[PDB]
Design an enzyme around this catalytic site. Sequence first.
Site, PDB file in Angstrom:
ATOM      1  N   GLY A 223       4.500 -18.396   8.050  1.00  0.00           N
ATOM      2  CA  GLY A 223       3.978 -17.737   6.854  1.00  0.00           C
ATOM      3  C   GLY A 223       4.982 -17.484   5.736  1.00  0.00           C
ATOM      4  O   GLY A 223       6.129 -18.003   5.742  1.00  0.00           O
TER       5      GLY A 223
ATOM      6  N   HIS B 111       6.939 -25.521   2.662  1.00  0.00           N
ATOM      7  CA  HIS B 111       5.681 -25.575   3.450  1.00  0.00           C
ATOM      8  C   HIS B 111       4.619 -26.397   2.801  1.00  0.00           C
ATOM      9  O   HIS B 111       3.913 -27.154   3.462  1.00  0.00           O
ATOM     10  CB  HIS B 111       5.086 -24.195   3.660  1.00  0.00           C
ATOM     11  CG  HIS B 111       6.007 -23.207   4.349  1.00  0.00           C
ATOM     12  ND1 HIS B 111       6.578 -22.180   3.698  1.00  0.00           N
ATOM     13  CD2 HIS B 111       6.401 -23.094   5.676  1.00  0.00           C
ATOM     14  CE1 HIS B 111       7.296 -21.434   4.579  1.00  0.00           C
ATOM     15  NE2 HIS B 111       7.199 -22.003   5.773  1.00  0.00           N
TER      16      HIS B 111
ATOM     17  N   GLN C 108      10.642 -15.942  19.659  1.00  0.00           N
ATOM     18  CA  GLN C 108      11.815 -16.586  19.079  1.00  0.00           C
ATOM     19  C   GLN C 108      12.687 -15.668  18.189  1.00  0.00           C
ATOM     20  O   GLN C 108      13.492 -16.162  17.396  1.00  0.00           O
ATOM     21  CB  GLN C 108      11.431 -17.883  18.353  1.00  0.00           C
ATOM     22  CG  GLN C 108      10.681 -17.725  17.055  1.00  0.00           C
ATOM     23  CD  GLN C 108      10.076 -19.021  16.569  1.00  0.00           C
ATOM     24  OE1 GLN C 108       9.056 -19.507  17.100  1.00  0.00           O
ATOM     25  NE2 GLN C 108      10.672 -19.568  15.526  1.00  0.00           N
TER      26      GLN C 108
ATOM     27  N   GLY D 289       9.787 -29.858   9.832  1.00  0.00           N
ATOM     28  CA  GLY D 289      10.754 -30.093   8.744  1.00  0.00           C
ATOM     29  C   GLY D 289      12.128 -30.451   9.258  1.00  0.00           C
ATOM     30  O   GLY D 289      12.556 -29.916  10.256  1.00  0.00           O
TER      31      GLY D 289
ATOM     32  N   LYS E 282      14.692 -29.500   7.839  1.00  0.00           N
ATOM     33  CA  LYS E 282      15.454 -28.275   7.562  1.00  0.00           C
ATOM     34  C   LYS E 282      15.867 -27.563   8.870  1.00  0.00           C
ATOM     35  O   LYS E 282      16.984 -27.084   8.987  1.00  0.00           O
ATOM     36  CB  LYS E 282      14.632 -27.360   6.608  1.00  0.00           C
ATOM     37  CG  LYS E 282      14.879 -25.846   6.666  1.00  0.00           C
ATOM     38  CD  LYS E 282      15.915 -25.364   5.703  1.00  0.00           C
ATOM     39  CE  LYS E 282      15.955 -23.827   5.636  1.00  0.00           C
ATOM     40  NZ  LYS E 282      16.051 -23.035   6.902  1.00  0.00           N
TER      41      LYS E 282
ATOM     42  N   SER F 245      13.583 -21.082   1.965  1.00  0.00           N
ATOM     43  CA  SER F 245      13.339 -20.320   3.177  1.00  0.00           C
ATOM     44  C   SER F 245      12.845 -18.954   2.753  1.00  0.00           C
ATOM     45  O   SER F 245      13.346 -18.371   1.797  1.00  0.00           O
ATOM     46  CB  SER F 245      14.596 -20.188   4.068  1.00  0.00           C
ATOM     47  OG  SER F 245      14.377 -19.324   5.222  1.00  0.00           O
TER      48      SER F 245
HETATM   49  N1  LIG Z   1      12.811 -25.939   2.725  1.00  0.00           N
HETATM   50  C1  LIG Z   1      12.102 -26.643   3.644  1.00  0.00           C
HETATM   51  N2  LIG Z   1      11.859 -27.981   3.531  1.00  0.00           N
HETATM   52  C2  LIG Z   1      11.134 -28.640   4.456  1.00  0.00           C
HETATM   53  N3  LIG Z   1      10.615 -28.050   5.557  1.00  0.00           N
HETATM   54  C3  LIG Z   1      10.787 -26.720   5.763  1.00  0.00           C
HETATM   55  C4  LIG Z   1      11.561 -25.937   4.813  1.00  0.00           C
HETATM   56  N4  LIG Z   1      11.566 -24.671   5.268  1.00  0.00           N
HETATM   57  C5  LIG Z   1      10.871 -24.643   6.448  1.00  0.00           C
HETATM   58  N5  LIG Z   1      10.418 -25.868   6.731  1.00  0.00           N
HETATM   59  C6  LIG Z   1       9.630 -26.306   7.869  1.00  0.00           C
HETATM   60  O1  LIG Z   1       8.396 -25.630   7.809  1.00  0.00           O
HETATM   61  C7  LIG Z   1       7.919 -25.435   9.149  1.00  0.00           C
HETATM   62  C8  LIG Z   1       7.689 -23.943   9.363  1.00  0.00           C
HETATM   63  O2  LIG Z   1       8.850 -23.207   8.987  1.00  0.00           O
HETATM   64  P1  LIG Z   1       8.884 -21.612   9.246  1.00  0.00           P
HETATM   65  O3  LIG Z   1       7.842 -21.096   8.317  1.00  0.00           O
HETATM   66  O4  LIG Z   1      10.281 -21.205   8.962  1.00  0.00           O
HETATM   67  O5  LIG Z   1       8.491 -21.487  10.676  1.00  0.00           O
HETATM   68  C9  LIG Z   1       8.996 -25.978  10.066  1.00  0.00           C
HETATM   69  O6  LIG Z   1       8.663 -27.319  10.467  1.00  0.00           O
HETATM   70  C10 LIG Z   1      10.240 -25.946   9.200  1.00  0.00           C
HETATM   71  O7  LIG Z   1      11.238 -26.876   9.600  1.00  0.00           O
END
Ligand SMILES: Nc1ncnc2c1ncn2[C@@H]1O[C@H](COP(=O)(O)O)[C@@H](O)[C@H]1O
Lengths: 280, 280
Positions: free
Chosen positions: A28, A34, A58, A145, A147, A183
């Site tokens: 979220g 995203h 996590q 991602g 990332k 992020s």
């Molecule tokens: N700046 C970004 N560029 C590409 N993918 C991202 C980025 N930030 C987060 N993600 C990806 O978004 C998905 C969810 O991220 P999170 O919301 O941090 O759990 C995961 O596959 C992350 O690797």
Amino acid sequence: SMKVISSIQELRDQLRGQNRTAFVPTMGNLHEGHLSLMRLARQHGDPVVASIFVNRLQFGPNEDFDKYPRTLQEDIEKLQKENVYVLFAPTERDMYPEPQEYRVQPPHDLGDILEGEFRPGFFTGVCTVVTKLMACVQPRVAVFGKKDYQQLMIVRRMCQQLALPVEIVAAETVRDADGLALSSRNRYLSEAERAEAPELAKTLARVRDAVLDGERDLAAIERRAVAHLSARGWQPDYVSIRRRENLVAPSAAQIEAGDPLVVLTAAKLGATRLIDNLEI
Amino acid sequence: SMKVISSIQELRDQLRGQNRTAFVPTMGNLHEGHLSLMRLARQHGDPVVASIFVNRLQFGPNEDFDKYPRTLQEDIEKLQKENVYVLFAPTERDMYPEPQEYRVQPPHDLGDILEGEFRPGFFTGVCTVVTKLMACVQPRVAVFGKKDYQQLMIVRRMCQQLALPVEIVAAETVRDADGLALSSRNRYLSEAERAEAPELAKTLARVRDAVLDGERDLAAIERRAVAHLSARGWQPDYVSIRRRENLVAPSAAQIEAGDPLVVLTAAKLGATRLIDNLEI
Ligand SMILES: Nc1ncnc2c1ncn2[C@@H]1O[C@H](COP(=O)(O)O)[C@@H](O)[C@H]1O
Ligand SMILES: Nc1ncnc2c1ncn2[C@@H]1O[C@H](COP(=O)(O)O)[C@@H](O)[C@H]1O
Ligand SMILES: [Cl-]
Ligand SMILES: [Cl-]
Ligand SMILES: [Cl-]
Ligand SMILES: [Cl-]
């Protein structure tokens, strides 16, 4: 009209008979990174299903579970504009009605290095929730991602080793105009921290160039990068140049043969822990 | 040791019986962008053959053919560190012993838009030399950078339409620490201009963000970005949001469907013309 679904059973009823679902799990507080994944998912499957769930498993006891950004109303508004069929937004009671005591454990040589040495147990928390979310959604494809590069590789190999019939699709990292990888945790940074934060990507670009320009002593490159960040008030956990295939440091011979490499880093600015990487 | 070859016939004798060659054509003055492409080439074929040739046919009379940076000995030293088996570095009498009067012409619609609108006949010069280089080297694979996005699509379709048995492999753009796409022409910029030049990539990131965040009036985004660069002392040619498949502007229906897009720009800073793009 996008459906917002908290109940596992209702999610299964809505997706009954769907054989080409593309799934994008998130925690979220949606940003352009995203949204880029949501667009990519649509090229790989139909319908696109997003999840928003902040996974307590996590987060370590000294991390940031309680202040993690939560903006579900806005997330919904953004997902609506990007042609997403279902948002799966379970409550903690839906995902974990009793404490989670079955866990998916990743390999020691991949789960306990890098992010796994500095965040013990992290990838057990990730593999467990991702297995669960895939068993709920039953997609054909899932987008992760670059990332979270280690994460991406861990989930890819998890699906293969547990025989989960899900193809993993990798998305490029989305950055702000100044180079900072997007992020939700970027919100934690003060103004002065925000102004310094782009130095992490700049440091990665400089290590990239040194490898491309022929420097063979990778550990010396890593050490200079760590010292550069430290002198400016960062506290790095690591800067590490590894093989893309298994995240192991290349041998001298593999460096000469040009095995594809990636430089990965994690470093704190105050209490905020930032991570980034650059394929070389 | 790396063989450096000038003569077409000698190149043919060196590459005789090689059915897996990966070819990377360049105009020399090599930077980390080019080196990245060399490394990628090695993953897709063997041997890796580079070429260095400044092609008169793709410079207009008011452009920079005479000043274009030439640093062959440096270039040779850099390639020797990247596992490259042959440098093809022909003189102008080697490639063009008489005036080039057979020309490969691309379609109008591909063609005479964007770079071909603002540099008339550019892609005829490019298609001609590229065909000639492929006929000399006879590779299985050739690696071209996304930095020259329109070129990349033009050469791919060219190979398919002339039945050239060469697979085109696309490389991601390599940028400086500060986001500026690397180019041998970066050299032309004064220091003040070099400090302003990252704004192009930054403007593209904001265009990207507007599209991902749901703005449907793409022409309006384009106009703001243009006006933005002008207010800062650029002379922009274009900022244009196109479909990746064919470089045409998407219909409202295609925006809604999420056809993969790319934003492309070309702009002057003083006398120096820079280009860049970002996949959205
Ligand atoms: N700046 C970004 N560029 C590409 N993918 C991202 C980025 N930030 C987060 N993600 C990806 O978004 C998905 C969810 O991220 P999170 O919301 O941090 O759990 C995961 O596959 C992350 O690797
Ligand atoms: N910064 C860059 N990143 C990736 N590829 C590039 C870059 N600059 C040039 N290229 C590619 O390298 C090849 C030679 O470019 P040039 O030497 O400008 O003719 C072409 O395929 C270009 O698109
Ligand atoms: Cl939430
Ligand atoms: Cl890869
Ligand atoms: Cl890539
Ligand atoms: Cl693409």
